[PDB]
Design an enzyme around this catalytic site. Structure first.
Site, PDB file in Angstrom:
ATOM      1  N   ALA A 177       0.760  -1.222  -0.059  1.00 17.89           N
ATOM      2  CA  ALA A 177       0.123   0.093  -0.244  1.00 17.89           C
ATOM      3  C   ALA A 177       0.836   1.291   0.049  1.00 17.89           C
ATOM      4  O   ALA A 177       0.615   2.184  -0.439  1.00 17.89           O
ATOM      5  CB  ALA A 177      -0.940   0.100   1.064  1.00 17.89           C
ATOM      6  N   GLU A 200       4.470  24.629  11.271  1.00 20.86           N
ATOM      7  CA  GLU A 200       3.346  25.333  11.967  1.00 20.86           C
ATOM      8  C   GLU A 200       2.245  24.516  11.757  1.00 20.86           C
ATOM      9  O   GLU A 200       1.095  25.153  12.273  1.00 20.86           O
ATOM     10  CB  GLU A 200       3.164  26.546  10.829  1.00 20.86           C
ATOM     11  N   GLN A 227       2.150   1.745  -3.584  1.00 20.00           N
ATOM     12  CA  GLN A 227       1.221   1.902  -4.602  1.00 20.00           C
ATOM     13  C   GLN A 227       0.354   3.280  -4.235  1.00 20.00           C
ATOM     14  O   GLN A 227      -0.269   3.812  -5.150  1.00 20.00           O
ATOM     15  CB  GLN A 227       0.175   0.737  -4.540  1.00 20.00           C
ATOM     16  N   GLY A 255      -0.798  -4.698   7.318  1.00 19.31           N
ATOM     17  CA  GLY A 255       0.135  -5.499   6.638  1.00 19.31           C
ATOM     18  C   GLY A 255       1.279  -5.978   7.477  1.00 19.31           C
ATOM     19  O   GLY A 255       0.982  -5.935   8.799  1.00 19.31           O
TER      20      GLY A 255
HETATM   21  N1  LIG Z   1      -5.679   2.728  -0.174  1.00 17.24           N
HETATM   22  C1  LIG Z   1      -5.142   1.661  -0.510  1.00 17.24           C
HETATM   23  N2  LIG Z   1      -4.797   0.580   0.208  1.00 17.24           N
HETATM   24  C2  LIG Z   1      -4.021  -0.468   0.208  1.00 17.24           C
HETATM   25  C3  LIG Z   1      -3.617  -0.588  -1.009  1.00 17.24           C
HETATM   26  N3  LIG Z   1      -2.965  -1.876  -1.334  1.00 17.24           N
HETATM   27  C4  LIG Z   1      -3.109  -2.441  -0.129  1.00 17.24           C
HETATM   28  N4  LIG Z   1      -3.996  -1.689   0.647  1.00 17.24           N
HETATM   29  C5  LIG Z   1      -4.368  -1.907   2.156  1.00 17.24           C
HETATM   30  O1  LIG Z   1      -3.340  -2.548   2.667  1.00 17.24           O
HETATM   31  C6  LIG Z   1      -3.720  -3.549   3.601  1.00 17.24           C
HETATM   32  C7  LIG Z   1      -2.732  -4.626   3.499  1.00 17.24           C
HETATM   33  O2  LIG Z   1      -1.531  -4.234   3.662  1.00 17.24           O
HETATM   34  P1  LIG Z   1      -0.667  -4.589   2.329  1.00 17.24           P
HETATM   35  O3  LIG Z   1       0.103  -3.451   1.800  1.00 17.24           O
HETATM   36  O4  LIG Z   1      -1.132  -5.319   1.194  1.00 17.24           O
HETATM   37  O5  LIG Z   1       0.684  -5.555   2.793  1.00 17.24           O
HETATM   38  P2  LIG Z   1       1.962  -4.845   3.023  1.00 17.24           P
HETATM   39  O6  LIG Z   1       1.976  -3.821   3.828  1.00 17.24           O
HETATM   40  O7  LIG Z   1       2.761  -4.632   1.725  1.00 17.24           O
HETATM   41  O8  LIG Z   1       2.906  -6.262   3.726  1.00 17.24           O
HETATM   42  P3  LIG Z   1       2.846  -7.527   3.443  1.00 17.24           P
HETATM   43  O9  LIG Z   1       1.587  -8.284   4.003  1.00 17.24           O
HETATM   44  O10 LIG Z   1       4.062  -8.421   3.677  1.00 17.24           O
HETATM   45  O11 LIG Z   1       2.683  -7.541   1.828  1.00 17.24           O
HETATM   46  C8  LIG Z   1      -4.864  -4.210   2.905  1.00 17.24           C
HETATM   47  O12 LIG Z   1      -5.981  -4.512   3.833  1.00 17.24           O
HETATM   48  C9  LIG Z   1      -5.589  -2.935   2.080  1.00 17.24           C
HETATM   49  O13 LIG Z   1      -6.667  -2.353   2.761  1.00 17.24           O
HETATM   50  C10 LIG Z   1      -3.698   0.248  -2.233  1.00 17.24           C
HETATM   51  O14 LIG Z   1      -3.229   0.240  -3.171  1.00 17.24           O
HETATM   52  N5  LIG Z   1      -4.542   1.567  -1.667  1.00 17.24           N
END
Ligand SMILES: Nc1nc2c(ncn2[C@@H]2O[C@H](COP(=O)(O)OP(=O)(O)OP(=O)(O)O)[C@@H](O)[C@H]2O)c(=O)[nH]1
Ligand SMILES: CC(=O)O[C@H]1C(=O)[C@@]2(C)[C@H]([C@H](OC(=O)c3ccccc3)[C@]3(O)C[C@H](OC(=O)[C@H](O)[C@@H](NC(=O)c4ccccc4)c4ccccc4)C(C)=C1C3(C)C)[C@]1(OC(C)=O)CO[C@@H]1C[C@@H]2O
Ligand SMILES: CC(=O)O[C@H]1C(=O)[C@@]2(C)[C@H]([C@H](OC(=O)c3ccccc3)[C@]3(O)C[C@H](OC(=O)[C@H](O)[C@@H](NC(=O)c4ccccc4)c4ccccc4)C(C)=C1C3(C)C)[C@]1(OC(C)=O)CO[C@@H]1C[C@@H]2O
Ligand SMILES: Nc1ncnc2c1ncn2[C@@H]1O[C@H](COP(=O)(O)OP(=O)(O)NP(=O)(O)O)[C@@H](O)[C@H]1O
Ligand SMILES: Nc1nc2c(ncn2[C@@H]2O[C@H](COP(=O)(O)OP(=O)(O)O)[C@@H](O)[C@H]2O)c(=O)[nH]1
Ligand SMILES: Nc1nc2c(ncn2[C@@H]2O[C@H](COP(=O)(O)OP(=O)(O)O)[C@@H](O)[C@H]2O)c(=O)[nH]1
Ligand SMILES: [Mg+2]
Ligand SMILES: [Mg+2]
Lengths: 429, 441, 336, 429
Positions: free
Chosen positions: B12, B254, B15, B143
């Site tokens: 996340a 600020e 991305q 995550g």
């Molecule tokens: N807003 C938004 N949330 C995301 C996105 N991708 C994943 N998430 C959120 O991130 C949560 C899980 O974290 P991840 O990013 O998938 O996993 P990680 O942080 O990379 O860690 P790992 O599990 O080891 O891959 C999910 O429940 C999603 O809600 C995104 O592209 N945009």
């Protein structure tokens, strides 16, 4: 010296005053922009009675314009003489009055009267020696009745020795265009009693009847009715601006027009009034002017003076005329008609003679009458008021805005009391 | 020079950074191969690219960012994709296995193997700075890399730097929608570094941005590409007055003087008011007055929350574009007039206005419209404790039966740390009960 | 050359429950009126007004910074000219004496950020940092007494019993007191917070931290490498006479210190009036509290400032007229 | 002779001073590059009050520009008059102030004040006989409040007999755009008490209200608010630069505006201020200018002087006017309004009359008032301060930068003490 502040309030008072500042501004040669384009040197010697001089020989009227609705202000600015007034004297709210006395005297008028009196004192404190005021308003509206009598009753607390008179329009039962106008007129006659030095009561039924019968107009508008009223308003303060053979100020009239206090309700009148075409048939002389000023069909109040007695009258003549004919024709009337004048006052008539007639005619005149027959006005209102109020009709639009019934019954009774003040001084020796 | 370091951790976090680094390339006029075009013989630092882009000589703009993930897959979309020579090759750090929804792997087992490589790269960006402002860490609560690694990194960034601000842009778990079953265990454990090491932590969640896309924007079926463009408009407005001219500019410090009362009361929710589709952007009255009211609306929040259940403590209005400040004071005084909006009784000077001149940029292929004005509202309120009570209850259900604990203990942590991080988050929720209530004698 | 100030304290919460009537009015800058209810012989009650004029009078809404600015703040530009200066806290018990001097009574703790000790020890250092007075190269050192059961104790060291001796030049010297060397204002707040935690005080429900001893805090101004004394600012917090209705639970221990507080102040009451008239033998050696306060009255470079503390209510109208009459007598004094 | 060093500090003080050096540079005909293009010989006889002459008949202002952030310096250089200033007087750090008083008065301001006072003494030691200083700053920021009062309290240690006055912007509760502005304003009113000879307190709510009501501006900007303030700042030191009939320097005002010391907080005011269009309707005379200077809606401080009494006022007239009308209109006000002036001081008003009006109008004026109604300002701050500090809100941003609470409670109490200094001298005979 002897300045006049003009406080026109409401719709009807602004329409009269907009026509009033087009007659005065012709008498003194004021351009629609405000410059001077006269030819007589008397047009500037007393121009400070109405006009403050501004930068570059422009002459701004000493008028204060009040409304509770922005619409009539937009009409006067966009009229012929929107250029003449100062833009700091267009005082107006946004929420309208409702044709409601309480809404313009208590709720939304008292919120504004602080922002109006602060402008009244900018005009009054700049004058050399102020003489008085004039309201132009309408008994029968929200702003002319309510807001006008709040403005009045807050100036007598600050200027308690200046001549305040009103040119007020009173309703008539023959011509109605407002359901609640007896409520709105009774509650403001009560204020005009205790607070005013002269009151020039005008009707509209009396002004169509002058246009129909005397002037022989076919389609009269409000621009014709206000044109008559504006010829009265200039005629009263003539000797204040122009030199004469006898002079009469506002205070000089009030001394000998008003025998007892509280009897200060006058009937105005103008002469000559001819139709077009029938002016080559009337010779203009002092016995000709006198017959119009005392005929009943040339009264701007819908009354007949044959149902009473004149306490006092005044006649203001404008032109190069004699003084014997003025002093004799004003004598030959109150002996021929001695049953129509009160006999414990010898020589009921006051003559004023100026030297300057209006700019299109010679020898005009102005009749101002303090007649006992004005109880015909106050009883036609106080019969309509007591027929609605005994059923409490249309009352929650008044008690919802702060009022109560105790203000009504007091105001009804003070109207019915001065009916019994003209009645005593009509009859009984 | 008002430079900032962006740190993008996990799937996340990467991305979102694809949506952030798309946008600044358009705000500053940088092609995807790092080049500004030849029609700019003007002040580049007067357009101030130099808070997000260090200018390599011979005309080249490389970002002040590091993308970290424990998984190789997500950063290999950036190699190639379209930004394949925007980024420096050594600031795109991949592991070999992800933490796999496991805080103990991201913090103890796997995370320590690249933590020296990540920190050494940040120093090579910290040395290129002249006037470094602070860090912009993006991650997701819930995550393994977004929680376990970020907790490891914020410990080490507090020891090396300390005095710098460290902003976080987290994604918090949503109440009904969840994508992971172990989503509550990884959010109680990231609580310790979020309150201790960060200086101002932001939270969003996916439900509260799904509803904004459906209602305010009429997207019937959003993807994550739609959402992260909305996160990026919050960031592009917050860091805007660092890099554009305007009356009433606001630095990143600020905020913290004017947004954070006490050192543990630093969790403010953001909004963004003209989220309007381009067809609905006609029939508009998108003035200062209407865009100020929309931030205080409980439906337009970026967090599933309701600020009519708690009291605001500060706000921070940041405007972009055709904005005259006398219009703002006439719009504040209407907000203070309303009785739905409860401030606290120790605030009385309510909140801080920032204004900027640079209007927002419309992303090609974007969902938003081309507006003259936009407002981000950062605002502390006591109502964010209600999002925390809805997640403690999910933790307290699963940890009552000690369900997924055996994965975490056999990776580098103890059972006792659950009972410490549950008490630790229960102490913040006791702080918001005690900071909102006015005092008598 | 003694400045006298008075401070009416406000009414507590418990005194509202007992329906206490306030009789002390401070209408102007430097006046005070005591409204005394009196009855005649025929049970016709009337009211007496006792006007007073002081150098400055404090209201009940004044804070400790305003009390500081008019009492001990002018006396800091005196200690840097070679003189010495003190200030009293003289009144009834329970009349806000250690709230003014010690600090604002924050229940279980003592908020020593207020008080006259800290606000002057801060203001020495700001004065010491001016380039006019930094040239002298002085060293600020602080000491802190306690006078309990007629004997001098110490509060920097824990329980060092102290003697009161005299130099050949007729100068009283407590020996051997602890005199720590103060670095900054963060150091002098560590003395006062540790000092007030060890001051001997009773424990009850009405005044849970009532003063039981005459605490004296000194700030000694020394040149560097000379071991003389260039200036001293000696604070004095008294204990206050108590003899109204103090019959709650007083055992043989409570009135042991109890009659010794009252004994120490009568010796102080006599030295005021003995200095009022002339040539008499000034009874400074009666109580040791008066032997410490010797240099305040007859000092040739001494500028003192007594702060008369006043309980406001009706039931303390008797002690109030007692306390105000001495401070008026303190004001009308010309030593030399 | 009688030079003035100008020390503009912060964002708000630099924006005012950049507009201030565009009004003075028009009064003396200074080109935007710095050359002279005037036509009157009086524009150069006292041009050394503000301008050092440089090589080749260029005139460099004696202004010192302070900030803790390089951004506002880049705006002033790139503005209309970046060419006018000397580049050695743009003193600025890099790390911003944080809207934090402690960060600009203790941590990052004390690091810079050595590099500012060393530049202040290059201006002051080159003057023939320096008169005084002027700060333009803002109570409510980091640099205008904190760094401004560190600069002030280090000049009175070196120039302890020169007139130092400030044109300082004070916050108002109606218009807030900073959460911690009560902390930042109380900690600098405490410095302005013991260190300043005159303090011209200005608000922003009072400056929109002049733009809204008086000037009838539709969309006011900060460029309009600073334009009013810059017309005051030129008006006060007019008789210092131009010949007059009565003269009044900075020291001559301070002698008879300040009865007791510590009462040196003034309310400025300017006249005439008309809307465009409504200037052909106002005649420009001395009774016209006097009514604006004493109306409450022409005060640049958001107070009403009807809630107090003027201790003393001053009126500085600029133009070929009489001296009787000045001496009579300033008399007809303090007798008509004798309940609004302190009566143990006869003739509260000081008249100064210059000969040179501004370059587009005749007969301007400047009102400076020492009113007791300025306790309305200091209590609106000291209610907000004591509502935050009793919960110790936003305090660790101050105690983390070297401060402690003892500096707060002292500064709160000195603000609350001088409220009880205007209160004593308002009432009680
Ligand atoms: N807003 C938004 N949330 C995301 C996105 N991708 C994943 N998430 C959120 O991130 C949560 C899980 O974290 P991840 O990013 O998938 O996993 P990680 O942080 O990379 O860690 P790992 O599990 O080891 O891959 C999910 O429940 C999603 O809600 C995104 O592209 N945009
Ligand atoms: C050829 C000729 O002599 O024409 C006359 C005329 O025919 C008559 C009928 C005029 C005419 O008046 C009207 O028809 C009329 C219209 C509306 C309202 C009232 C009257 C006249 O219009 C009006 C006009 O009045 C004036 O000039 C006065 O100065 C008058 N002015 C205005 O009212 C005025 C009108 C427009 C613009 C500015 C001012 C006045 C009266 C008192 C105080 C001040 C001014 C005059 C004598 C005439 C005409 C032109 C036909 C009469 O009125 C007046 C006010 O004089 C109506 O009865 C008189 C007798 C006149 O003889
Ligand atoms: C046709 C005419 O007479 O126009 C006037 C004018 O209409 C009015 C409304 C002017 C006008 O001022 C404003 O509208 C205004 C705008 C921003 C901030 C403050 C005022 C005027 O712009 C301002 C201008 O002022 C000056 O020329 C003074 O010298 C003034 N100058 C500046 O402020 C200045 C402006 C731009 C560039 C350089 C200097 C001044 C005043 C005190 C000390 C030094 C200089 C004047 C008289 C006018 C206009 C041009 C319409 C007024 O202001 C001044 C300062 O005179 C506003 O109320 C007065 C009354 C004037 O009559
Ligand atoms: N000016 C004041 N404002 C508010 N509370 C006050 C004030 N002065 C005293 N008090 C309170 O009064 C109580 C008792 O004050 P205290 O200072 O102990 O009186 P005292 O005379 O010193 N009693 P003692 O210590 O035996 O001498 C405490 O709760 C103080 O907080
Ligand atoms: N003579 C005259 N009467 C008018 C005019 N306009 C309105 N009126 C009368 O005034 C009465 C009501 O007063 P109005 O003008 O409505 O006053 P307002 O509502 O308080 O402002 C109505 O009966 C109208 O007949 C006018 O121009 N001239
Ligand atoms: N009158 C006026 N006020 C301003 C201007 N710029 C900022 N302010 C006000 O100044 C206050 C804060 O002072 P600031 O300019 O931020 O000072 P700084 O941060 O210390 O440099 C804010 O409330 C603004 O309303 C200006 O150009 N004119
Ligand atoms: Mg992954
Ligand atoms: Mg005590």
């Amino acid at each position: 010296m002897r300045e006049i502040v003009h406080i026109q309030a409401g719709q009807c008072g602004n329409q009269i005053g907009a026509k009033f500042w087009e007659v005065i501004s012709d008498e003194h040669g004021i351009d629609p922009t405000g410059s001077y384009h006269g030819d007589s040197d008397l047009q500037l010697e007393r121009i400070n009675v109405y006009y403050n001089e501004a930068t570059g020989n422009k002459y701004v009227p000493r008028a204060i314009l009040v409304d509770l609705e922005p619409g009539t202000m937009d009409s006067v600015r966009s009229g012929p003489f929107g250029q003449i007034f100062r833009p700091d004297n267009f005082v107006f709210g946004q929420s309208g009055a409702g044709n409601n006395w309480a809404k313009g005297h208590y709720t939304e008028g008292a919120e504004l009267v602080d922002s109006v009196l602060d402008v009244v004192r900018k005009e009054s404190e700049s004058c050399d020696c102020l003489q008085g005021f004039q309201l132009t308003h309408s008994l029968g509206g929200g702003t002319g009745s309510g807001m006008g009598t709040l403005l009045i009753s807050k100036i007598r607390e600050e200027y308690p020795d200046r001549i305040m008179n009103t040119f007020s329009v009173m309703p008539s039962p023959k011509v109605s265009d407002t359901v609640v106008e007896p409520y709105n007129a009774t509650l403001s006659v009560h204020q005009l009693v205790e607070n005013t030095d002269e009151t020039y009561c005008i009707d509209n039924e009396a002004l169509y009847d002058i246009c129909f019968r005397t002037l022989k107009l076919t389609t009269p508008t409000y621009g014709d009715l206000n044109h008559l009223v504006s010829a009265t308003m200039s005629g009263v303060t003539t000797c204040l601006r122009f030199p004469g053979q006898l002079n009469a100020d506002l205070r000089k009239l009030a001394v000998n027009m008003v025998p007892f206090p509280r009897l200060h309700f006058f009937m105005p009148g103008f002469a000559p009034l001819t139709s077009r075409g029938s002016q080559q048939y009337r010779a203009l002389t002092v016995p000709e002017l006198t017959q119009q000023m005392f005929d009943s069909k040339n009264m701007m109040a819908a009354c007949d003076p044959r149902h009473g007695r004149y306490l006092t009258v005044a006649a203001i003549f404008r032109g190069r005329m004699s003084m014997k004919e003025v002093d004799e024709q004003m004598l030959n009337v109150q002996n021929k008609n001695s049953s129509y004048f009160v006999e414990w006052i010898p020589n009921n008539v006051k003559t004023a003679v100026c030297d300057i007639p209006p700019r299109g005619l010679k020898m005009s005149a102005t009749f101002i009458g303090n007649s006992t027959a004005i109880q015909e006005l106050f009883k036609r209102i106080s019969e309509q008021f007591t027929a609605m109020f005994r059923r409490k009709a249309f009352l929650h639009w008044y008690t919802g805005e702060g009022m109560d019934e105790m203000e009504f019954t007091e105001a009804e009774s003070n109207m019915n009391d001065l009916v019994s003040e003209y009645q005593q001084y009509q009859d009984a020796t | 020079m008002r430079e900032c370091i962006s740190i993008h951790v996990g799937q996340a976090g990467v991305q979102i950074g694809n949506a952030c680094w798309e946008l600044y390339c358009l705000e500053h006029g940088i092609q995807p191969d790092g080049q500004m075009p030849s029609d700019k013989t003007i002040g580049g630092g007067d357009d101030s690219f130099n808070t997000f882009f260090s200018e390599t000589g011979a005309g080249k703009h490389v970002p002040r960012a590091v993308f970290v993930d424990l998984e190789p897959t997500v950063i290999d979309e950036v190699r190639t994709g379209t930004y394949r020579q925007l980024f420096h090759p050594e600031q795109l750090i991949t592991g070999k296995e992800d933490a796999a929804n496991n805080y103990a792997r991201g913090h103890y087992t796997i995370g320590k193997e690249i933590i020296d490589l990540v920190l050494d790269r940040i120093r090579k960006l910290a040395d290129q700075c002249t006037g470094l402002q602070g860090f912009l860490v993006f991650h997701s609560f819930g995550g393994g890399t977004g929680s376990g690694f970020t907790s490891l990194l914020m410990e080490r960034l507090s020891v090396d730097y300390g005095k710098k601000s460290k902003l976080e842009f987290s994604i918090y778990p949503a109440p009904q929608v969840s994508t992971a079953v172990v989503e509550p265990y990884n959010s109680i454990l990231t609580t310790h570094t979020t309150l201790e090491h960060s200086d101002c932590a932001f939270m969003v969640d996916n439900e509260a941005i799904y509803d904004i896309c459906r209602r305010n924007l009429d997207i019937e079926r959003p993807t994550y590409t739609n959402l992260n463009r909305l996160i990026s408009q919050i960031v592009s407005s917050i860091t805007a007055s660092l890099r554009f001219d305007g009356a009433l500019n606001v630095d990143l410090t600020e905020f913290q003087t004017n947004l954070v009362p006490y050192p543990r009361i630093h969790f403010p929710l953001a909004t963004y008011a003209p989220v309007i589709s381009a067809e609905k952007a006609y029939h508009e009255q998108l003035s200062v007055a209407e865009i100020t009211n929309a931030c205080f609306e409980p439906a337009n929040q970026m967090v599933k929350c309701d600020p009519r259940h708690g009291k605001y403590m500060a706000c921070c209005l940041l405007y972009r574009g055709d904005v005259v400040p006398k219009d703002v004071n006439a719009a504040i005084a209407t907000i203070k007039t309303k009785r739905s909006i409860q401030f606290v009784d120790w605030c009385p000077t309510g909140f801080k206005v920032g204004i900027n001149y640079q209007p927002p940029t419309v992303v090609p292929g974007g969902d938003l419209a081309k507006v003259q004005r936009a407002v981000c509202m950062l605002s502390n309120t006591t109502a964010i404790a209600e999002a925390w009570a809805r997640l403690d209850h999910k933790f307290d259900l699963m940890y009552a039966k000690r369900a997924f604990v055996h994965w975490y203990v056999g990776e580098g942590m103890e059972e006792g740390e659950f009972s410490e991080a549950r008490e630790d988050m229960a102490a913040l929720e006791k702080d918001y009960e005690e900071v909102g209530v006015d005092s008598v004698e | 050359s003694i400045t006298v100030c008075v401070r009416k304290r406000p009414i507590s919460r418990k005194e509202v429950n007992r329906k206490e009537i306030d009789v002390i009015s401070v209408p102007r800058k430097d006046m005070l009126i005591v409204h005394e209810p009196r009855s005649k012989v025929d049970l016709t009650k009337f009211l007496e007004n006792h006007k007073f004029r002081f150098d400055y009078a404090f209201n009940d809404t004044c804070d400790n910074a305003m009390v500081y600015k008019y009492t001990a703040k002018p006396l800091v530009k005196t200690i840097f000219e070679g003189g010495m200066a003190t200030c009293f806290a003289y009144g009834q018990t329970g009349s806000g004496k250690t709230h003014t001097m010690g600090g604002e009574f924050n229940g279980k703790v003592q908020d020593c950020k207020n008080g006259i000790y800290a606000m002057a020890a801060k203001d020495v250092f700001v004065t010491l940092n001016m380039p006019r007075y930094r040239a002298m190269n002085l060293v600020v050192s602080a000491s802190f007494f306690e006078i309990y059961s007629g004997k001098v104790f110490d509060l920097l060291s824990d329980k060092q019993k102290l003697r009161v001796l005299e130099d050949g030049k007729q100068q009283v010297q407590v020996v051997g007191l602890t005199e720590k060397v103060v670095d900054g204002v963060e150091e002098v707040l560590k003395l006062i917070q540790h000092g007030n935690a060890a001051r001997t005080s009773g424990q009850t429900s009405a005044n849970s931290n009532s003063s039981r001893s005459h605490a004296v805090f000194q700030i000694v101004l020394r040149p560097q490498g000379s071991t003389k004394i260039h200036g001293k600012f000696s604070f004095i917090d008294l204990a206050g006479n108590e003899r109204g209705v103090d019959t709650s639970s007083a055992d043989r221990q409570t009135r042991m210190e109890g009659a010794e507080i009252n004994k120490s102040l009568l010796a102080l009451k006599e030295c005021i009036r003995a200095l009022g008239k002339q040539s008499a033998h000034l009874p400074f050696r009666v109580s040791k509290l008066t032997q410490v306060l010797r240099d305040s009255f007859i000092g040739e470079k001494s500028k003192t400032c007594m702060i008369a503390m006043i309980s406001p209510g009706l039931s303390s109208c008797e002690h109030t007229l007692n306390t105000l009459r001495y401070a008026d007598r303190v004001k009308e004094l010309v030593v030399k």
